[PDB]
Amino acid sequence: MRCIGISNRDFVEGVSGGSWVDIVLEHGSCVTTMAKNKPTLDFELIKTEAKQPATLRKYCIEAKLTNTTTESRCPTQGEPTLNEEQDKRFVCKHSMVDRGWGNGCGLFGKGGIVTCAMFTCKKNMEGKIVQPENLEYTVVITPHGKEVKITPQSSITEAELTGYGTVTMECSPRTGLDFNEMVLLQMKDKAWLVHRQWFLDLPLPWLPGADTQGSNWIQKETLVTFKNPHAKKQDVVVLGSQEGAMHTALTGATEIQMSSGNLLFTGHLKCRLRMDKLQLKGMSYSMCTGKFKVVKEIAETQHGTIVIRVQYEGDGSPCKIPFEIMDLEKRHVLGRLITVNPIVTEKDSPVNIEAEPPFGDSYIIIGVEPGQLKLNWFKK
Amino acid sequence: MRCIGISNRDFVEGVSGGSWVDIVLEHGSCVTTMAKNKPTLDFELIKTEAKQPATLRKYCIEAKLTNTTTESRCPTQGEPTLNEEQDKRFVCKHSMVDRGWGNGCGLFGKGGIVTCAMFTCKKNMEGKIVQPENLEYTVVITPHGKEVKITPQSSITEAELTGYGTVTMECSPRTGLDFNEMVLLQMKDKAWLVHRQWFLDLPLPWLPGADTQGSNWIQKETLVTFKNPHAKKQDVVVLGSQEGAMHTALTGATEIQMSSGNLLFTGHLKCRLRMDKLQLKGMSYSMCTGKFKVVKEIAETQHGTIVIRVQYEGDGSPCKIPFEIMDLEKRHVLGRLITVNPIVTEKDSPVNIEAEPPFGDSYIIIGVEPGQLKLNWFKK
Amino acid sequence: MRCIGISNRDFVEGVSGGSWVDIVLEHGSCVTTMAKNKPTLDFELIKTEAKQPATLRKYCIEAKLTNTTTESRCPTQGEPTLNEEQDKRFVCKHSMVDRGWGNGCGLFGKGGIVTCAMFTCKKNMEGKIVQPENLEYTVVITPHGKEVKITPQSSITEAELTGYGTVTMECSPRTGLDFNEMVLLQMKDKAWLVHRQWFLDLPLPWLPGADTQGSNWIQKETLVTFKNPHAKKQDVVVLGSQEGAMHTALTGATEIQMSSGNLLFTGHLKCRLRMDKLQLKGMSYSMCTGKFKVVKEIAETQHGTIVIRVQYEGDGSPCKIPFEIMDLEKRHVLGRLITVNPIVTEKDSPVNIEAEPPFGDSYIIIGVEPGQLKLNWFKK
């Protein structure tokens, strides 16, 4: 088997009207239901993706300076000026400089000076926001299939399934990210989920999200430094590419994989199915009594939870996986289990168990004592 | 007819307990249900409104300068000063200026100078945020009516309906805006929905949202420019009203209509009705076989979806509107249809069909081939 | 009694499958249900807490200045410099100052000067954000108990209850705060809920949320002022502790009580219970006919609603509390009542009634005319 059956309590057959069913669809899993004398149905969330996220802000990480120009005046000659001061492509600075007989002036004193240099971004990176319009879930329904799209705005879909006819499916996000707080930082072919404020405070030149020209950078001086003015000239220098510094700053950040302009997430949905009055098949699994083997150690998800991948090597599958979370002592914690009714449908086949441990030290207990796994975990 | 009946699968009559019903209420539509030997009931969302949204920030778009004053010193006389430098109503600037025998000093050199001018906002605009407390939906229930209010915080209401007695109605928002990302920009009698960051980065003088005085503007220099200082005087000039520039900057922005301090939105609700155990009337509509006429071409909604207004000119109404969305090729897309179970209750009467097309090029297909409408659409 | 029974319409027993039940759990209340020949069950939300909220930003409210150092040059000697200019712990300022025979220079004129002073924060405060991972609700289920944890990410829990066996409980937040808009401001042992932008615009030196060192403050000049330079020295002064000013600025702000690193909120949940097919006990209460006494006058909650605490002194309890909200005239308002089906389970025992009045002037009407309470209220 590959598919997990719903519990008898997961559906209600009305005296009149239809039959309502609740199902939880997590990546890697398969949920099945069957009506009397009707084709068996499988439900599976295939992917969660954000398509074409809009740009919140663009940051320049490598800029080059060219066309340096300076206007210097002698005492009594007033303020210098440059047309470039009005060209947003240029970074400029006004200051005072010593003038005298050595540099063509008849008086010794401070003279005004202004220098401008053309700022050209060579490499940038941008923060993008995921809005409701960008999120899409893909669910496949297989009678024995049909691929349906689900979005935050369009959560309801009617699908005709042979044997059942029309069946309504209404799904909503269950364990994702707060896209108002978390922003997607993109540098070339890579991406990371980062906090919005951290992103907005980065000390780099920037342009608004809807900017198309990409030339009138704000806060160019974050990368530019004007050297001390000489009598009639002044040099302007720039930091080198900040690509490396960004990588360092991103050390702990969650990395997201991209598919050319679109990102893949580990989605989780809660769905309600509405169909004609029909007596459905409920399933009850016995607790596994065998030992489990850890396939992949406790790992954090992209969305503040953890997953432990295990494999059942005992007997009696399909069976329910004994699971518990307890505090520093031995007090069990009810709740915190994302993968409710965790069942292994077969032996020697990896299964993901998702959970949300309490802050501090806790223990993840899997299986019954004969070979029971006791995993430590520290959070935040 | 005007009202659309629920599907048999849209309700469940318990063996014991009550009867639960699901209904979707969109603007322009009417949903009806009827119990056995009981009065027929109509449900309709009448309006979605945001009342008294609080101010996030206030921007000055037209300022006037008065009371220009300057203190200028000769070399060796140190720094000039003005009491107004401490008055937040004034914009001030310190600089150096050439002094000499021509302007009353005994020595030629740079002297410090300071100039302040009173900044007075003449016209402002403000960004307002819609919080949960500001949103209100109005639903009318008509037996054959009763007006009920629904808010994000108070989504449940018990209403006594003759024939049914008490019936519980629980509704929640279904296809709206992300008020954490979108902000309402107001200029006089007009309003627009804009992105929060774009708004927060506007290069204009501003005051915090809770500000009541409206005089101590931050960043006055966004509108003010100090001319080059003369020996003992200096002029200060200001940009003109930025009303026009804002209109240009708002070119593509979604415009929102206001009703003196309150804004109207196109709301959409999902509601659950709970009532005494009762056998309800379910309705099944046949597919329309006639031709449709486009009343209003595909138009974008305020909330990232689209609406196509059509009219049925064929026979057999009430009937279901054949509808489909397909990609650049001909692959149909399941889901994406906001107006599920789109039915025309009568001939020659406009009906709104809402949908959320995929990014890129897609086709909206309405009606069956004999005169089928094939509408192109490009998104993002 | 202490517990409130569900209404017959609050549950549905399927012909096949299970029995689904809806319950609303508010602080201070107790909801009970009972199946035929089964133990009676009580449900109660015990607390809503945010644990270990991450820091958004840190502000310094009291800083001390030490190690003031200045480099001053004579005319013709160019720009002064200090190594400390590169030390982020120091606040520095460049300017011009008059030099002459009185201070060791051979020429009279403006000379460059630079002064730096070590900035050390002595007292800070920080804004923290509540993310989904930080919120936890504690619900106790008592047969006649079991404590279950509920979080935004883990809203579903299966609990074994003697007599019923396994029962699924799925709960979600119902009347809380928008943690994307509201931020927690913490000063020592106290805390307040404040608007994010107001917080982000405070005119104080700051450090990013993930900052651990707490020494390289941004915008130190918000607290520091450089006095007018003297020939070879210059004093730097700082504002005193801004603790008092903050308290003044926080005058109207909602205060939150803390429990050493974690905050307590008034939570409200909506829960769905799924269990084996079982005929449950529904309860119908008669309207109270007696007089009520006000225990605590209308008070605002932490989340934009109001609560009126009353006591029933009449006869017939348990009975339903007559309740209504009406506008400036006498037009009743349906909806707006958070505590739906407000019942007093006993005489002389305080009961909280929560509601969300319309903006403007409204009246809260409690009880039937013989001694009816008519409470005024103004909102926003």
Ligand SMILES: *[C@@H]1O[C@H](CO)[C@@H](O)[C@H](O)[C@H]1NC(C)=O
């Ligand atoms: C530098 O001179 C101007 C300054 O903007 C610029 O247009 C040009 O491309 C640069 N090179 C030349 C022509 O010197």
Ligand SMILES: *[C@@H]1O[C@H](CO)[C@@H](O)[C@H](O)[C@H]1NC(C)=O
């Ligand atoms: C300008 O002078 C002061 C400067 O603030 C101001 O109070 C006054 O109204 C203005 N007009 C006068 C009296 O000159």
Ligand SMILES: *[C@@H]1O[C@H](CO)[C@@H](O)[C@H](O)[C@H]1NC(C)=O
């Ligand atoms: C001031 O001098 C340096 C400046 O940073 C500092 O390290 C030291 O602790 C202070 N006190 C002394 C040694 O003068």
Ligand SMILES: [Cl-]
């Ligand atoms: Cl000089």
